């Protein structure tokens with residue numbers, strides 16, 4: 001297996017890999033163009049996002065936006081994200097329809113072994129993140145690697161999501177807990 | 183009743199109202215000027231803040247700063263904010279005298295219904311935020327919509343404030359709780 | 365004691381002090397140059413950090429990076445920090461070998477008295493931060509003033525650290541608590 005295939009599949013990979021280095025530069029180029037583009041530039045922004053992401057249809061994303069690869073982000077219909085959102089997509093980040101991200105939401109997929117020896121060994125690895133339909137994620141929340149958020153979930157601002165979230169609940173806190181059922 | 187008066191009053195409003203859209207454009211223009219202002223350009227900075235806010239006297243605000251409208255921000259005397267502070271002022275954000283915001287403090291006022299049908303309906307709404315005199319808000323705190331913070335309050339770094347905070351306490355945590363009486 | 369000596373030693377100091385002011389200005393110049401440097405400007409980035417920090421050997425720091433003075437930052441071998449990290453170094457921030465900071469980690473040393481009269485009095489003070497060897501700090505964590513983090517610690521994303529952390533543990537939450545032993 002290619003290092004890219006290993007990375008996407010959530011296995012140990014090498015980021016210094018040639019293809020991956022090139023992929024990150026391509027994404028950086030597109031991100032940079034996205035972020036310095038004007039808001040009146042709809043065709044350009046839409047064109048850049050179609051190029052960047054694995055899947056996208058309607059998407060309103062305020063700069064500044066950031067991702068690592070782009071092709072690991074899969075966004076359902078009518079996606080909305082306020083400024084300073086970060087989607088670090090070492091592994092697939094799959095988001096359903098009608099998602100709303102408030103400002104400064106961070107979604108991570110990269111991780112490291114907790115054991116220091118292993119960590120300092122160059123080991124690189126990620127875990128996918130999946131988010132359902134009609135999910136609202138409040139300002140400055142953090143969604144950790146390997147998390148699955150169900151449909152119709154409201155994530156309060158500043159929440160740090162470390163475990164799966166079932167359908168139809170409001171979560172909040174660090175660590176995030178169920179606040180109430182919808 | 184114009185959409186603007188509805189917005190400010192904390193009622194359902196339509197952001198696409200032409201007057202509100204002109205208003206956000208003006209704010210972005212002013213914010214952009216502020217953020218790219220060289221350092222010794224203190225006059226320019228002061229004049230921009232006088233033009234942007236609903237009320238301001240002495241105010242030291244390190245770029246980058248961000249707000250939505252500007253005119254819903256009312257700042258008391260001797261206001262101070264470190265870099266990357268954000269005041270999303272769909273509704274009034276009233277802050278008393280001698281306020282100190284550390285870096286990356288976010289104050290929000292916009293909200294959404296928790297019900298997904300209602301949320302996906304295009305319903306736009308906010309709640310005011312009021313902060314007292316002599317309040318010190320630590321790095322990366324989040325102040326949520328509808329919250330009132332009393333006088334002489336210390337908000338610990340990273341705190342996420344979801345409810346009123348009475349006078350003379352230190353609060354911290356997410357959710358933020360009383361840590362000690364002053 | 366020059367105000368500088370007081371600042372560094374964690375005593376009440378006056379920031380408006382000319383050398384300090386010059387020192388902060390110098391730091392801003394270097395940071396600015398670092399932050400706008402293109403990637404392949406290896407030589408330059410490394411040269412700038414050598415000039416900025418009190419101690420550094422191998423350090424990979426993704427822009428944007430930010431500090432107050434630079435000379436209060438002491439970094440051990442093989443230092444790594446992702447983008448948006450902030451080290452506000454009014455007092456010494458001493459970090460061991462093989463440290464890894466995920467994006468948007470904030471380390472603070474400045475503080476203010478909790479008493480309002482004393483706070484509004486112009487009182488300026490800091491507390492040193494010390495971090496051990498082989499520490500991995502997750503995305504958007506906050507390390508507060510006066511904290512000491514032992515060796516082989518993993519600080520979970522979004523954790524807010526307010527008290528010392530002993531060797532060989534994973535901490536997480538706000539406030540951060542021991543999640544498990546390593």
Ligand code: PBM
Nearest residue numbers: 001002003005006
């Ligand atoms: C089509 Pb392959 C498992 C580098």
Ligand code: PBM
Nearest residue numbers: 082101102292293
């Ligand atoms: C228009 Pb909503 C990301 C507070």
Ligand code: PBM
Nearest residue numbers: 282283284474475
């Ligand atoms: C210079 Pb004080 C708002 C951490």
Ligand code: PBM
Nearest residue numbers: 365366367369370
């Ligand atoms: C050798 Pb002195 C405490 C400016």
Ligand code: PBM
Nearest residue numbers: 110111464465466
């Ligand atoms: C691939 Pb690590 C510096 C969150």
